[PDB]
Write a protein that binds this ligand. Sequence first.
Ligand SMILES: Cc1cc2nc3c(=O)[nH]c(=O)nc-3n(C[C@H](O)[C@H](O)[C@H](O)COP(=O)(O)O)c2cc1C
Ligand SMILES: Cc1cc2nc3c(=O)[nH]c(=O)nc-3n(C[C@H](O)[C@H](O)[C@H](O)COP(=O)(O)O)c2cc1C
Ligand SMILES: Nc1ccn([C@H]2C[C@H](O)[C@@H](COP(=O)(O)O)O2)c(=O)n1
Ligand SMILES: Nc1ccn([C@H]2C[C@H](O)[C@@H](COP(=O)(O)O)O2)c(=O)n1
Lengths: 234, 234
Amino acid sequence: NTMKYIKAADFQSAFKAVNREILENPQFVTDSRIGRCNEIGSMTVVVDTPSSFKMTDPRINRISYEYAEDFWKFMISGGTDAKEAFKAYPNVAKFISKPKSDALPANFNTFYGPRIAAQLPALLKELKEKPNSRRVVFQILESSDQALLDSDETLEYPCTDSVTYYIRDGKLYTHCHMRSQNCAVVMQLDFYLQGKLLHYIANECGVEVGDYTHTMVSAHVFERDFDYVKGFLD
Amino acid sequence: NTMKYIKAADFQSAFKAVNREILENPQFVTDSRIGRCNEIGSMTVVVDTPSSFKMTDPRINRISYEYAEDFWKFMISGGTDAKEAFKAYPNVAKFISKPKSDALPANFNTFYGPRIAAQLPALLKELKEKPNSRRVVFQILESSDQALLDSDETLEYPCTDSVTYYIRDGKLYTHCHMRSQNCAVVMQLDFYLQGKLLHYIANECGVEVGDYTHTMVSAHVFERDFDYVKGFLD
Ligand SMILES: Cc1cc2nc3c(=O)[nH]c(=O)nc-3n(C[C@H](O)[C@H](O)[C@H](O)COP(=O)(O)O)c2cc1C
Ligand SMILES: Cc1cc2nc3c(=O)[nH]c(=O)nc-3n(C[C@H](O)[C@H](O)[C@H](O)COP(=O)(O)O)c2cc1C
Ligand SMILES: Nc1ccn([C@H]2C[C@H](O)[C@@H](COP(=O)(O)O)O2)c(=O)n1
Ligand SMILES: Nc1ccn([C@H]2C[C@H](O)[C@@H](COP(=O)(O)O)O2)c(=O)n1
């Protein structure tokens, strides 16, 4: 039976367990916007030790850690010069190009970094100053992104919905809610970015780290990636 | 050990199981913005039969179904005349009053209805026309709501983060992500509103209903409500 709740000691064990479950016990086998995938709806993943966001198995190699670190620096710096930041990676071109349609402005982008940057002052203030706040939610996906739905744009319609942080008894807890997760490939990047970000937040707040929860409305592995996944399982 | 994943046949069984777990096996006992509560972080609740959103046990009476239905009509109609809609309920006054601070405008409100109304056309179009879309997310909590964090306003800083809908094989699946859930009281209302809304969506799309998933970054019961909860358990 499809296991939707996965608790693991570290990011890599969670990553392997999620991918194995999607391959072996999918809830749906579905033809999606970008091809056929196995899918589990509404998976919840808990990582006990969020310092482990750099996975050690070199067979999990579709997101290199050079790329992941370049992406982290691009994101946390809150800039929009993706062409410069990812000039060494030509295959990300369709995700970093200017909008084509005149409908939405040319300043429009879906980069997470500027959105995190805009919210950091108010959210850090709440996180540091309102004891036991439940209100600290970084919004990534925005309703204004819905202008992308009926367009031919290739920009990411944000896969990450929100990241909630809360502190209890000196520890920072994190809940990343994903609208849509490519578990075999991009999740390696998402885990890296979220691991870096939560440590950034914990350090700004002077607190230690609890655990990390990752919910995914669609947790999927494309059929084209099954051989890749099998290559890192066992 | 604290059970964070609860699967139940109907909303009431989920409701009772969640409340029991928070009372008996909290992750945190914490003094919050609005008083001491037992709390479980990042709970996931699955309801197999989402038609069951009106609970039958009359001891679960803090949200009357007259009030819940008035709230539903107020929400789905997308209006802002809360004073008129809830005139028969004086205790909701602090949640429906105009903003006090000149910082945010007088048109500012955090009612869910207008936000659902604004997104319905684009999201229904995606849901009906893009097969197996993963993109249909109603955003409730918005980053612009963060202006409430450092204010003395009593308006709700949205407890509901987002509601994602997706269709696979003729069935509508729903994932409601809550930032913050008062599980003993308001969750009765949230379950009613989400049950009504998902049936509204399924009917607009001409599809049947799958299941309903409810994730809560903070799932809590205030100590002041423990006697009430005990009164409906068993
Ligand atoms: C700003 C930006 C947004 C991106 N968005 C997506 C995306 O939404 N979906 C996706 O699959 N890859 C996206 N990518 C590319 C991934 O980060 C990564 O390069 C890719 O998953 C590697 O795929 P491959 O090794 O199979 O070619 C994005 C890259 C950038 C720089
Ligand atoms: C527009 C609106 C927003 C509300 N927001 C909240 C809220 O954020 N938190 C809350 O506890 N009750 C809120 N309420 C009140 C609840 O819907 C409900 O009346 C209350 O939980 C009943 O509490 P009581 O029976 O313990 O008095 C709101 C009511 C309205 C009309
Ligand atoms: N941070 C991100 C951004 C996007 N995606 C993936 C999920 C989908 O495989 C695809 C987005 O497609 P869709 O919008 O149809 O969900 O990219 C991901 O895994 N992580
Ligand atoms: N639809 C809603 C709106 C709010 N709340 C609850 C959660 C908290 O008990 C409180 C909101 O307080 P806070 O903003 O501190 O989380 O109201 C809820 O349960 N459901």
